[PDB]
Amino acid sequence: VEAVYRCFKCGREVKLDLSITRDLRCPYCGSKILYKPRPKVPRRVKAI
Amino acid sequence: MIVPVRCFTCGKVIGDKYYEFKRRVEAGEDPEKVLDDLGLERYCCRRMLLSHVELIDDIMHYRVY
Amino acid sequence: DVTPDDLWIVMESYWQEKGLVRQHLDSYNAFIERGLQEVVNEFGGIKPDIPDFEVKFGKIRVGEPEFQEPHGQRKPLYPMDARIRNLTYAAPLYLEMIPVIKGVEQDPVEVRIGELPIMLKSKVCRLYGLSDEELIKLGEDPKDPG
Ligand SMILES: [Zn+2]
Ligand SMILES: [Zn+2]
């Protein structure tokens, strides 16, 4: 299923699917490296 | 990397006095007089302000998302 | 007379002008400048099992660090990408071949004989001569000695 990713260099938003994409590319700047962004869910951290 | 909030030994809050101390010392004032003015008599507190490094600016430029 | 506190000023300029790893960069730069040509001139040329044709070697040229993408063309490469993508920070190596027909020379031809790994911050690396701002923009620590 389609997922959300962020570019390594330009930090923009890039959407693609790994199971189908035969060539990972950032369409805005051509970077071959992408990040997986933090999910938007709350997490609990103990302050100890 | 940023200034500690409290002195490690006695727990006194010294987090907010670092920038004041740095700016006053850069102006050429006597560091001992500045520290006495700020109200740090025990050397345990003075060490935290004297030996600190501000590395947050150096490490801030690389982002991870 | 002078004082040790004065000689310290002179001594500091030594590490200021010259880095702490000069014994690597100087040797590698000398290698790039002369050693390739010397080792090529040692061999001289190639004489295969041919009646009247042989090739004598020419100059050696090394280009900028580049990488041939499997799905695209040759692209500029930077150390961060190389050490993230498990690549090898190397640059193309170019050699000129002079063909000789029956004792006369023909037009030179330049070919790619391989890739040579590049020592960081050397005279051919992409990080050479860059300011701290540029290195920051490239994802590098400006205090790295290479
Ligand atoms: Zn991008
Ligand atoms: Zn204290």
Swiss-Prot record, chain A:
SMART domains registered for this protein in UniProt: RPOLCX
InterPro entries: RNAP_P/RPABC4 (IPR006591), RPABC4/Spt4 (IPR029040), Rpo12 (IPR023464)
Superkingdom field: Archaea
Pfam families: Zn_ribbon_RPAB4
EC numbers on record: 2.7.7.6
Any one GO MF annotation of this record: DNA-directed RNA polymerase activity
Reaction(s) catalysed by this chain's protein: RNA(n) + a ribonucleoside 5'-triphosphate = RNA(n+1) + diphosphate
Cofactor note: Binds 1 zinc ion.
SUPFAM superfamilies according to UniProt: RNA polymerase subunits
Subcellular location per the Swiss-Prot or TrEMBL entry: Cytoplasm
Enzyme's top EC category: transferase
Cofactor requirements of the protein: Zn(2+)
One Gene Ontology cellular component annotation held by this UniProt entry: cytoplasm
Residues engaged in binding Zn(2+): 10, 26, 29
GO biological processes: DNA-templated transcription
Keywords: Cytoplasm, DNA-directed RNA polymerase, Metal-binding, Nucleotidyltransferase, Transcription, Transferase, Zinc
UniProt record similarity statement: Belongs to the archaeal Rpo12/eukaryotic RPC10 RNA polymerase subunit family.
Function of the molecule: DNA-dependent RNA polymerase (RNAP) catalyzes the transcription of DNA into RNA using the four ribonucleoside triphosphates as substrates.
Subunit structure: Part of the RNA polymerase complex.
Full protein name: DNA-directed RNA polymerase subunit Rpo12
Curated annotation (Swiss-Prot), chain B:
GO biological process annotation, one example: DNA-templated transcription
Catalytic reaction list: RNA(n) + a ribonucleoside 5'-triphosphate = RNA(n+1) + diphosphate
Main location (coarse class): cytoplasm
Gene3D superfamilies, per the entry: Homeodomain-like
EC number of the protein: 2.7.7.6
Manner of cofactor binding, per the entry note: Binds 1 zinc ion.
Matching SUPFAM superfamilies: RNA polymerase subunit RPB10 (SSF46924)
An annotated GO cellular component: DNA-directed RNA polymerase complex
Quaternary structure and interacting proteins, as annotated: Part of the RNA polymerase complex.
Protein name: DNA-directed RNA polymerase subunit Rpo10
Species per Swiss-Prot/TrEMBL record: Pyrococcus furiosus (strain ATCC 43587 / DSM 3638 / JCM 8422 / Vc1)
